Amino acid sequence: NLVKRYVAAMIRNTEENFKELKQDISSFRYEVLDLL
Amino acid sequence: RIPLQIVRAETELSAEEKAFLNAVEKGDYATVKQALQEAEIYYNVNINCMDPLGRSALLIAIENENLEIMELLLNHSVYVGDALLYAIRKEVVGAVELLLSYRRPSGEKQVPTLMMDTQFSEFTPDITPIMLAAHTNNYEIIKLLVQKRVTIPRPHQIRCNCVECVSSSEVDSLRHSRSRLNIYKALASPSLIALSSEDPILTAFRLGWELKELSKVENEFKAEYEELSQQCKLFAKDLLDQARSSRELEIILNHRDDLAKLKVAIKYHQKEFVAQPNCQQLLATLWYDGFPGWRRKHWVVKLLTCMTIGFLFPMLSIAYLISPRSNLGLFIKKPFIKFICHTASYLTFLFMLLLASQHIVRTDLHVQGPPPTVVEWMILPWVLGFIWGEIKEMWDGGFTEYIHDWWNLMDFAMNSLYLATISLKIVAYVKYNGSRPREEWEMWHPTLIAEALFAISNILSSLRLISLFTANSHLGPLQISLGRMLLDILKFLFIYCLVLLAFANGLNQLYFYYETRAIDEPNNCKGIRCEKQNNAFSTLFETLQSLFWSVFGLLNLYVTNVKARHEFTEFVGATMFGTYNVISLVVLLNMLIAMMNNSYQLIADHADIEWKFARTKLWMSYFDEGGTLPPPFNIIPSLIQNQHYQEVIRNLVKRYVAAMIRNTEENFKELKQDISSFRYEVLDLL
Amino acid sequence: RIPLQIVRAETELSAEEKAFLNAVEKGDYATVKQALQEAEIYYNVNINCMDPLGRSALLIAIENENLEIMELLLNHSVYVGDALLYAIRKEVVGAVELLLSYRRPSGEKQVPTLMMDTQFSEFTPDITPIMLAAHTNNYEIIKLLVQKRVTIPRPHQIRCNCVECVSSSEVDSLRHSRSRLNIYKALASPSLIALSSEDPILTAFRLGWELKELSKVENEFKAEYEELSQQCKLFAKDLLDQARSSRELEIILNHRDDLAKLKVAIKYHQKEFVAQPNCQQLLATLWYDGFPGWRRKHWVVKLLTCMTIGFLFPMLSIAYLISPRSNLGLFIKKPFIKFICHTASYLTFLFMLLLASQHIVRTDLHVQGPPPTVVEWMILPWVLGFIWGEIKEMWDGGFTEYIHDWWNLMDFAMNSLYLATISLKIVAYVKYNGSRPREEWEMWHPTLIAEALFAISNILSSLRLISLFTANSHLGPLQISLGRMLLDILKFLFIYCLVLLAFANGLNQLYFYYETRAIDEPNNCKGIRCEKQNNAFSTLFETLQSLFWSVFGLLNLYVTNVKARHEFTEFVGATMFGTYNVISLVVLLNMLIAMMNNSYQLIADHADIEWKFARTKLWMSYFDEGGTLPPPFNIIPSLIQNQHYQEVIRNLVKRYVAAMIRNTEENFKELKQDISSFRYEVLDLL
Ligand SMILES: CC(C)CCC[C@@H](C)[C@H]1CC[C@H]2[C@@H]3CC=C4C[C@@H](OC(=O)CCC(=O)O)CC[C@]4(C)[C@H]3CC[C@]12C
Ligand SMILES: CC(C)CCC[C@@H](C)[C@H]1CC[C@H]2[C@@H]3CC=C4C[C@@H](OC(=O)CCC(=O)O)CC[C@]4(C)[C@H]3CC[C@]12C
Ligand SMILES: [Ca+2]
Ligand SMILES: [Ca+2]
Ligand SMILES: [Zn+2]
Ligand SMILES: [Zn+2]
């Protein structure tokens, strides 16, 4: 029980991240243009 | 090598359940809807299935803030246990609204039966949703919970000795401590105080005092109780800071259950509330009641006015006695004139004590019981006025408040010394008639004891002037740091007294066989106070005095030498004295320097606030009419207020809520979730 | 009231130009394309129009990273001046590629003529694109610029006295300083050093040394030159840290133009490069050459081996003399045995100097010129060996390197003292024959002067042991902090010497009339070194000695009293002495304590690195074969390396580039721009 609670606590508690959002927006933009 | 295995069994999720949880994580509404519609007909997927990290489908919907997937999972009657706690901790208003509003409609046939999902809960089982919402400090969720008729349990007294508190502490102390800390954390939130208290300032003051007392009592949980008290004090100061007019500030300060709320804040030690700039401006305006534009003036005219009003001490007090309703008698009732007159009276008393120690007045010292000189006859009314003022301060305000000042101990000591010297003088006058010369007087002569007590009282009277340093703008924080470093000096002096007692015991036990009489030694003296330093380690008192005086270097090195040629005993005593000198001059004093240095750095940031608090405490001591006369002259023989306070607190609470609303990897996950959900819906529609 | 007006005329943008700039800002491609297509036919909008903030349409396209709008604005032949600088500062690889590649094709009829756009440039006119790319530290843009045959101007020497440097400094010093700082900032980038230098470590070392010397010279721009030197040193340490094998580390350290590169790093004061952990491990392995697993052992066996090898000092040096190729003679060539033998020899010399001051050897003190005792006859070979070792150290390494150690000054002083005492002893032996008693000797007797110089040399020899503190792991940073605080003590002692000279001048000028002869005073002595303290302010030297001794409290208070009853002069002198005591004991010493306290806090963070640098400098002093014998016994009569270094530096540069690539409101504006451009294109298509 202590290990489960500690794992929940540690899960609960940068330029790579924004690149994901640019990548997700760019991939959605190309697929929308390709389908349309 | 080392084999590695999963020690604790986590059941693996099936392919359909893993695909369903992945679809819920990616926010694909159509696939999740298809899986939910296929779940009832075929029973393939347990909708309440968990993940490796302990989240269910509903918790994954709550964490990503997908309201559509949240309501869709709610429409198929998934397990909903403790999801409101996760929504409240996530501070999502829409999720809390959905979980509050959907639990009531369309409940049919109990709930569908489910087993073995309920072991893992991130939130503690003692927690309730209103308490966790109070801990989160979110306003909208607290408001929505308070609208639905929700209550919180009342904590007991800290010194509670009833059967149920003692039984809960004995059976499970950890659960009781966690429940009390959670309840006080819920009660200390600014939003709950603003929403569920008709007097937020007084409630914040009482909660801060109770949290400080609990931190003083509970040793294990001191830090979070101190944090809660600081949060309550900052909430009170922030609510006071939101005022917009002088009338609102005077309505807030003068509200009663003149400045009653300021006195209540001072009684609860709310330094941030007292040291706010607008309250300081109002106290400065009240302090300079009869002197408008005091801050404007060049310092020469201010000092000239101070000199001319301090030199006019013997008038303006008899004028108050003879005509209190006259124009001249009304100027003494202002606080600045009262403080200047009291300072002038104390300076006159100090100057008279300086003048009493001169050869112009003192004559014929060879009288056993001397009559009091005219300087003493005039000084006696000041001592009587000080006695009457101290006893009046003991009566008014109560005996429980007279002892908390900590300056009254010196006043009690000074009054005791004056009473002792007066009694010794009167007894020496009454029954020591004669003119015997002073060289053959008894060592226990009451005249000498009376003069020694008079000198000690004169030292205490001259050292009483440190308390006036709060009035200046430069000597206040200096004495605040001095007060903290005095406590650190006491903490040092305990260990120093222990080391001094140990070394004095050793030195006396070694050296008390070689004691010599005063007749054998030169000049008929015995001690460390001779021209030639005599036996310094012959007695315990003499050893203590000699070890005390060695710190300042006033004790020579030949005190460890004996008459006989006992070289080993002399070397052992010299080693003892050297070890004591090395300790008390290389370790202890430098450690005291290091301790008071560290303390000053901590003290400086807070030095102003406490200086302003001390100056406010000194200023309101002169506001009342009790004690208008100086020490030389004090012995000479309504619901509209509550409605306005409620209006001002209402506007202040609205402004503070607007200010606090105006003033991480979870966030970007929302943007990935919003982009992913929009991408799936665009692909599905197209 | 106060009127407010636009003091400096910014021309207002028209409606069409403002709409066009707003459309370019929002990323709407179709509206911008329509406006550009309508611009030529109707001439309505100046495409090179500016904004209120100084950006054009092309700069707005570059800042939002809209490559489509960027190429569309390029296709209509807009002004392109200095846009490559904005692209390089924005670190956009695609924008730099587009601006490099589009400037060449389709240039027809010069450029279209445009006026009055060219005044406002954020980048300075001296700047060039390769230099700004070097300042930005981006790798891809630097690579693309270097591929197109681009060069950078060479900075001159710091001590340059040519006509053009002096003329540029006299005509415009600010432009010259900015150009030199920009050039050195371009040359100090890690990417340019990795791309355009065949030896990045040596280039970084030379650039760091040049930047440190420029920071020492240029007073105005010290901080950025120190930052550039720190950046070069950190680049060198980071490139050294990327190694993966011991062979690569030994190839890097042993590369020449044995450990040549380590010596070059020590010569350039690269403390971070020397104090790297792998180089420290290699130096520890070389240091414990014959003792494998030295760190493994319990401390008793290590101390026993140290005692048995230090007590075996007189053997293992004659063994090296008689059989250097034997098994026993080869053990002295290891560095640890060399250091232990030298420490044992110096400890033996110190113990012999202690033994020379005993009554067992010294006999018949009433001889004028005494022959040297047998202890002195044996001590003389150690002094000769020290002289030969110091002169050998002067010859080998050069006179320009012998003076930078700062420990050689004490060795020079010790050798001078030994030569002076030997010359005084030999002259006293040769021409002072007799047995006159010591009580009637001349004050300038060479025997007494020789003994005083011998005592001072003995003090210097005993205080020479501080330099061995680098060998231990606990006494190294302590003496590093001691070395910094000694410089701070010198900075204090300058002001103390000035104050002491002033007060000594005043005291001597006041008190030198009351000088008395030695015959009149008791015991025939004159000075502060009597039982009764004589005239202490009679001469300048005596006044200086008395004011020096008053700091430690060894000067009594009755030295300011004169024979006659001149109360005013005595009071003035007492006030003078009291003011000097208050200064030198209340202000100066406490200020020195505060200064050395602050210094220690700064010193502690860097204390290890410099301790490791000092220990590395001490360790490699014993690596060479010059000075194998102790002081008592030293007077007894290839392109594959470059190819491997290039391979290792190649792999290190690739690993460092990968590491640096692996390790704000502009960013969110990209996401708003990408979402806005996608929204307009979806609306346009639909
Ligand atoms: C320096 C030597 C000669 C000893 C002096 C002893 C006393 C004559 C001093 C010690 C503390 C002094 C007091 C420190 C601070 C103030 C407050 C000062 O007024 C303010 O700071 C204005 C603001 C306010 O208090 O309302 C007026 C003088 C007074 C009473 C001073 C009067 C003179 C005092 C009693
Ligand atoms: C404490 C009193 C009695 C004075 C002692 C004076 C000397 C006998 C001391 C002063 C400094 C000492 C030295 C300080 C440090 C070292 C390094 C130490 O070796 C290490 O620290 C191991 C690592 C290495 O140096 O390679 C061996 C002893 C030695 C030479 C010490 C030998 C004894 C020394 C010369
Ligand atoms: Ca009182
Ligand atoms: Ca040397
Ligand atoms: Zn109870
Ligand atoms: Zn030049």
Curated annotation (Swiss-Prot), chains B, C:
Q: How is its activity regulated?
A: Activated by G-protein coupled receptors via direct interaction with GTP-bound GNAI3, which increases the channel sensitivity to phosphatidylinositol bisphosphate. May be activated by intracellular calcium store depletion. Calcium channel activity is enhanced by MYLK, that promotes its subcellular localization at the plasma membrane.
* Ranges lying in the membrane without crossing it: 298-332
Supply one GO BP term: neuron differentiation
Q: Which domain of life is it from?
A: Eukaryota
Name the organs or tissues of expression: Expressed in brain with higher levels in fetal brain. Found in cerebellum and occipital pole.
The record places the following residue ranges in the Cytoplasmic compartment, namely 1-297, 333-335, 392-405, 470-484
This enzyme catalyses: Ca(2+)(in) = Ca(2+)(out)
Keyword DNA damage annotated: no
Which cystines does this chain contain?
Answer: C525-C530
Start and end residues of the ANK repeats are 14-44, 53-81, 82-108, 125-154
One GO cellular component assignment for this chain's record is:
growth cone
Q: Which sites bind Ca(2+)?
A: E390, E393, N408, D411
Keywords carried by this UniProt record: ANK repeat, Calcium, Calcium channel, Calcium transport, Cell membrane, Disease variant, Disulfide bond, Glycoprotein, Ion channel, Ion transport, Membrane, Metal-binding, Repeat, Transmembrane, Transmembrane helix, Transport, Zinc
- The regions listed as transmembrane in this protein's record are 336-356, 377-391, 406-426, 449-469, 485-507, 576-596
Q: Which residues form a coiled coil?
A: none
In this UniProt entry, which residues form the Extracellular topological domain(s)?
357-376, 427-448, 508-575
Tell me which family the UniProt entry assigns to this protein.
Belongs to the transient receptor (TC 1.A.4) family. STrpC subfamily. TRPC5 sub-subfamily.
What is the name attached to this protein's record? Short transient receptor potential channel 5
The species is Homo sapiens (Human)
Give the lineage. Answer: Eukaryota, Metazoa, Chordata, Craniata, Vertebrata
